[PDB]
C-alpha cells in the first residue's frame, strides 16, 4: 500500500489509464458471460430430451429396447463395471427407489436425508433443471413427486431457485444473490417431516382442569432445502451471522452438487460408480 | 454388492440408461467444443485491449488524457484513493515483476536472482489451441535488447488437455510443453548454480578451466516442466507437476486478466 502511494505523477497516470482499460475489458467479459449463458441454455435444451427419456425408463412408463440393453452391456464391459451384467437364462414397475438410492450416495447431500425423509423420497420420480432464461439469471431445480401415491404432500413439483446477481463478480463470473424455495403442502403435521411434534397431557392440581399440549419443533430434515435461509438484515448479530452463512454455503453447495453431478450422472450415482 | 446380486428386471432397465448416458457424453462433447470456440472467440476481443496495456507499460505509447480522466473517476468510485493525483521516467518499471510478487502461488517461487531477470519482462500473453489438441500457451515477451540473461524474445508454456473428456465431462491436463530458454552465460543462468575452476600447468603453458552446473530452484524452471515419464519418486514428481499446472491457472485466470490490480495489490 505505501509502495503505490509514493509513486510518481508520471506513473500513477500510467496505472490510472490501465485501470481504465480494465473497465473496458470488464465490458467485454460481460458480453462473454451473456453468450456464455445462452449457449449453456441451448445445450440444456438438448440434454433434456434424453433425461425426460430416462425418467420414463425410471417410471416404468416406457420400456427398454433390446437395442439399448445390449448396446448397454457393451458399455458395462467396456468400462469394466460388470455389476450390471445378467446371468444366462431366457417384477416391479420401473426400477425401485431410484432417486432415493441415488441421493443416498452423493457426497454433500447424502449426509442430509434422514430416516423420515427417506420415506418421502421414495415418491420422487425425477429431478429437473432449467436456466432462468428471462429476467435475472439463475437456474431452478425441479422435483416431480407422484401426486397420486405420495402421502406426504399434495405437491406434484417442488422447485428451488438460485438467482445469480446481475452484477458480474470481480473474477468476471456469476455470483449468487439468494435462493428462493418452493414451499411444501404436507397433508398432515404427522406426515410433515420438516417438523417433529411432541405432545404431553398435564393435570392442574389446583383447577382440576386437564389439557394435553401439542408442541411443533422444527427439526433438521432434508426438505428444509426448500425453505432456504433468507438474508436477514443489516441489524447485526454474532455467531448468528457466521452460523447463518455456513448454512447458505451448504444450500448453494447442495444446489451445485445436484445440478453439476447428480442429475448429469444419475445412473452411475444410483449404482455407486461415480463415487 | 448392494446391486450385484439383486433383481434382473432392474439391472435390465439400468443398462438402457447407462446407454442414454453415453448419448449424453456425446452431446456434452459437442458442447465442450462450441464452449471452447466461444472462449477463443472472445480471447480475440481481449488481446487488443490487453495489447494496449502492453504498450502503455513499455512506454511505447502514452496515456490519453481521456483514459487518465476515466481512471481518475473509477479509482475514486472504487474507494482506491491510494492511486490519485491532486494538482521524467519511462513506462511502468518492474510491472510484471511486481504483479507476480503479489500473485499468491507464484511469488513464493521467484528467487532473488530471477527477479533481476523478471525485470526485463514486458508482457504475458494468452492463446488457446485447436491446432490439434486442446490447451493454451502463456507467452512471455522479454525485452530482448536489454536482457543480459538470455537472448530469447519470447519464452512461454503450453498446457495440453487430453483429447477425451473426463467423467465430469470437462478436460483433464495431459502434460505441459516448456518453451525452454537460451541463456548467454552460465553465470547468467538463474536456473542453475555454477562453480568454476582454472588450472594452469607451468611446463605446458596451458590453462584448463572447468565449469560445473548444478540445477537450482528457480522460477524459470516454469519453462522446463515435469514430463510424464521416469514410491518417493512419483509422490514427489507429482506434487510439482501439480504446483506447475496450478501456477499456469494462476497466471491465466488472474494475473493476466487483472494485471493492474495485481500490480497495485487491489487484487488481494
User: Do A11 and B53 lie within an 8 Å CB cutoff?
Assistant: no
Q: Cβ(B219)–Cβ(B118) under 8 Å?
A: yes
H/E segment holding residue B140? strand B135-142
Q: Cβ(B100)–Cβ(B90) under 8 Å?
A: no
Give B137's strand partners.
Answer: B127, B158
Q: Which residues contact A100 (CB under 8 A, 6 or more apart)?
A: A113, A118, A121, A122, A124
User: Do A21 and B67 lie within an 8 Å CB cutoff?
Assistant: yes
Q: How far is CA A114 from the centre of its chain?
A: 17
Interface membership of B182 toward A (CB under 8 Å): no
Task: Please tell me the total count of domains within chain A.
Answer: 1
Ramachandran angles phi, psi of B197, nearest 5°: -155, 120
Ramachandran angles phi, psi of B117, nearest 5°: -75, -55
Q: From CA A247, how far away is CA A228, in angstroms rounded? A: 9
Give chain A's largest Cα–Cα span. 91
Q: What is the DSSP letter of B81?
A: G
Best mutation target, A6, A12, A24, A269, to test chain B (most B CBs within 10 A): A12
Burial of residue B150 (number of CB atoms within 10 Å: 0-12, 13-18, 19+):
buried
Q: Which residues contact A254 (CB under 8 A, 6 or more apart)?
A: A108, A109, A112, A225
Cα angle value A141/A169/A37 (rounded, 5°): 45
Give B201's strand partners.
Answer: B206
Q: Which of B27, B89, B169 is facing A11, going by the closest CB pair?
A: B89
Q: Chain A window 43-62: which residues touch B at a Cβ cutoff of 8 Å?
A: 43, 46-47, 50, 53-54, 57-58, 60
Q: From CA A206, how far away is CA B11, in angstroms rounded? A: 67
- Give the up-direction half-sphere exposure of residue B111: CA atoms within 13 A in the CB hemisphere: 14
Q: Cβ(A234)–Cβ(A74) under 8 Å?
A: no
- Give the up-direction half-sphere exposure of residue B77: CA atoms within 13 A in the CB hemisphere: 10
With CA atoms as reference, the chain A residue closest to B65 would be A17
With CA atoms as reference, the chain B residue closest to A11 would be B92
Per-position DSSP letters for B168-237, written without gaps between them: TSS--EEEEEE----BS-GGG-TTEEEEEEEEEETTTTEEEEEEEEEE---GGGGGSPPPS----HHHHT
Q: How many Å lie between the alpha carbon of A157 and the closest alpha carbon of chain B? A: 23
CB atoms closer than 10 angstroms to residue B24: 21
Interface membership of A265 toward B (CB under 8 Å): yes
Q: From CA A273, how far away is CA B18, in angstroms rounded? A: 11
Q: Which residues contact B221 (CB under 8 A, 6 or more apart)?
A: B191, B215
User: Do B38 and A43 lie within an 8 Å CB cutoff?
Assistant: no
SS (H, E, C) B109-139: CCCHHHHHHHCCEEEEEEEEECCCCCEEEEE
Q: Which of B223, B200, B224 lies closest to B210, judged by CA?
A: B200
Q: Which residues contact B31 (CB under 8 A, 6 or more apart)?
A: A43, B169
Q: Chain B window 234-253: which residues touch A at a Cβ cutoff of 8 Å?
A: 253
Q: How many Å lie between the alpha carbon of A104 and the closest alpha carbon of chain B? A: 13
Q: Which of B192, B115, B188 lies closest to B150, judged by CA?
A: B188
Q: Which of A25, A39, A86 is facing B34, going by the closest CB pair?
A: A39
- The x, y and z cell numbers of residue A130, run together, are 432449467
By three-state DSSP, how is residue B78 classified? coil
Residues B42-45: contacts with CB within 8 Å, 24+ apart? B42/A28, B42/A29, B42/A31, B42/A32, B42/A35, B43/B126, B43/B127, B43/B128, B45/A28, B45/A32
Q: At which residue does the C-alpha cell 492511486 appear?
A: B83
With CA atoms as reference, the chain B residue closest to A62 would be B13
H/E segment holding residue B9? helix B8-58
Give B71's strand partners.
Answer: none
- The x, y and z cell numbers of residue B116, run together, are 533481476
Per-position DSSP letters for chain A, written without gaps between them: -HHHHT--HHHHHHHHHHHHHHHHHHHHHHHHHHHHHHHHHHHHHHHHHHHHHHHHHHHTSSPPPHHHHHHHHHHHHHHT--TTPPPS----SS-TTHHHHHHHHSHHHHTT--HHHHHHHTTEEEE--EE--SSS-EEEEEEEE-TTT-SSBS-SEEEEEEEEPSSPPTTSS--EEEEEE----BS-TTS--SEEEEEEEEE-TTT--EEEEEEEEE---GGGGGS------TT--SSTTTHHHHHHHHHHHHHHIIIIIIGGGHHHHHHTTT-
- Let me know how long chain B is: 268
H/E segment holding residue B11? helix B8-58
Contacts with B24 from chain A: Cβ below 8 Å: 47, 50, 264
The resolution in angstroms reads 3.2
With CA atoms as reference, the chain A residue closest to B29 would be A43
H/E segment holding residue B87? none
User: Do B46 and A58 lie within an 8 Å CB cutoff?
Assistant: no
Q: From CA B35, how far away is CA B33, in angstroms rounded? A: 5
By three-state DSSP, how is residue B155 classified? strand
Q: At which residue does the C-alpha cell 456469476 appear?
A: A174
Helices A66-79 & B8-58 angle (0-180, nearest 10): 60
H/E segment holding residue B258? none
Q: Cβ(A140)–Cβ(A161) under 8 Å?
A: yes
Q: From CA A123, how far away is CA A271, in angstroms rounded? A: 19
Q: How many Å lie between the alpha carbon of A209 and the closest alpha carbon of chain B? A: 56
Ramachandran angles phi, psi of A153, nearest 5°: -140, 160
Cα dist from B244 to B99, B142, B220, B241, whole Å: 18, 21, 12, 5
Determine the structural domain holding residue B192 and report its residue range. 1-268
Q: Which residues contact B265 (CB under 8 A, 6 or more apart)?
A: A1, A3, A4, B102
Q: Cβ(A220)–Cβ(A114) under 8 Å?
A: yes
H/E segment holding residue B148? none
Q: From CA B224, how far away is CA B245, in angstroms rounded? A: 12
Q: From CA A141, how far away is CA A103, in angstroms rounded? A: 14
**Torsion (CA) B216, B222, B227, B230 in degrees, nearest 10:** 20
Interface membership of A271 toward B (CB under 8 Å): yes
- Beta pairing, strands B135-142 & B121-129: antiparallel
Q: From CA A40, how far away is CA A168, in angstroms rounded? A: 17
Q: From CA A109, how far away is CA B223, in angstroms rounded? A: 42
Q: From CA A224, how far away is CA A112, in angstroms rounded? A: 10
Q: From CA A159, how far away is CA A222, in angstroms rounded? A: 14
Cα angle value A223/A225/A231 (rounded, 5°): 140
Give A197's strand partners.
Answer: A216
Ramachandran angles phi, psi of A157, nearest 5°: -125, 135
SS (H, E, C) A40-98: HHHHHHHHHHHHHHHHHHHHCCCCCCHHHHHHHHHHHHHHCCCCCCCCCCCCCCCCCCH
Q: From CA A174, how far away is CA A133, in angstroms rounded? A: 15
Q: Cβ(B100)–Cβ(B108) under 8 Å?
A: no
- The x, y and z cell numbers of residue A67, run together, are 437395442
- Let me know how long chain A is: 275
Give B158's strand partners.
Answer: B137, B177
Q: Which of A222, A89, A242 lies closest to A160, judged by CA?
A: A222
Amino acid at each position: 500500500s505505501g509502495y503505490v502511494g509514493g509513486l510518481p505523477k508520471n506513473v500513477k497516470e500510467k496505472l490510472l489509464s490501465l485501470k481504465t482499460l480494465q473497465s473496458e475489458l470488464f465490458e467485454v467479459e460481460k458480453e462473454f458471460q451473456v453468450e456464455m449463458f445462452e449457449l449453456e441454455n441451448k445445450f440444456l435444451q438438448k440434454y433434456k430430451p434424453i433425461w425426460e427419456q430416462r425418467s420414463r425408463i425410471i417410471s416404468g412408463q416406457e420400456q427398454p429396447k433390446p437395442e439399448q440393453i445390449a448396446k448397454g452391456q457393451e458399455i458395462v464391459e467396456s468400462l469394466n463395471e460388470t455389476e450390471l451384467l445378467v446371468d444366462e437364462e431366457e417384477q416391479v414397475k420401473g426400477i425401485p427407489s431410484f432417486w432415493l438410492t441415488a441421493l443416498e450416495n452423493l457426497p454433500i447431500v447424502c449426509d442430509t436425508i434422514t430416516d423420515r425423509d427417506a420415506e418421502v423420497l421414495e415418491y420422487l420420480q425425477d429431478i429437473g433443471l432449467e436456466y432462468l432464461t428471462d429476467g435475472r439469471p439463475g437456474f431452478k431445480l425441479l422435483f416431480r413427486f407422484d401426486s397420486s401415491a405420495n402421502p406426504f404432500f399434495t405437491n406434484d413439483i417442488l422447485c428451488k431457485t438460485y438467482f445469480y446477481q446481475k452484477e458480474l463478480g470481480y473474477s468476471g463470473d456469476f455470483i449468487y444473490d439468494h435462493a428462493e424455495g418452493c414451499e411444501i403442502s404436507w397433508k398432515d403435521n404427522a406426515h410433515n417431516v420438516t417438523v417433529d411434534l411432541e405432545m404431553r397431557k398435564q393435570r392442574n392440581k389446583t383447577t382440576k382442569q386437564v389439557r394435553t399440549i401439542e408442541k411443533i419443533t422444527p427439526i433438521e430434515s432434508f426438505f428444509n432445502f426448500f425453505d432456504p435461509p433468507k438474508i436477514q438484515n443489516e441489524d447485526q448479530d454474532e455467531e448468528l451471522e457466521e452460523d447463518l452463512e455456513e448454512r447458505l454455503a451448504l444450500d448453494y453447495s447442495i444446489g451445485e452438487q445436484l445440478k453439476d453431478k447428480l442429475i448429469p450422472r444419475a445412473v452411475d450415482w444410483f449404482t455407486g460408480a461415480a463415487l
